[PDB]
A = this chain, B = another copy of it.
Amino acid sequence: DNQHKKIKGYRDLSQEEIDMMNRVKELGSQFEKLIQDVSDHLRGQYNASLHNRDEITRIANAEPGRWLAIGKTDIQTGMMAIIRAIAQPDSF
């Protein structure tokens, strides 16, 4: 109960701040859907390329799954930074 008063640096948030944070998180959910769609595209591309040595090698060299994971991480940490800008903890 009222666990935020127990966590260092956290403060009481207004309804406006909570609403802005939730807007960030909902836009993030949309990005999650998009990233899942891209991952499905990559799976289908790899499948359609089976036993095409040159195209499989091209895909492997491009490393698209690693780049998608990098992008997902960046989107999530950007979300966290914006939410911190809104919520403004009282601590380092």
The proximity string for A residues 36-64 relative to B, scoring 1 for CB distances below 8 Å and 0 otherwise, is 01100110000000000000001101101
Known contacts: A25-B9, A27-B30, A74-B75. The answer to whether A62 contacts B88 by CB under 8 A is yes
Contact with B along A1-26 (1 / 0, CB 8 A): 11110111100110010101111111
B91 touches A25 (CB 8 A): yes
Q: Which residues of B contact A73 (CB under 8 A)?
A: 70, 78
Contact of A38 among B4, B30, B86 (CB under 8 A): B86
B91–A68 contact, CB under 8 A?
no
Known: A28-B91, A38-B86. 7 other contacts (CB 8 A): A7-B21, A8-B29, A27-B27, A67-B85, A72-B78, A75-B75, A80-B80
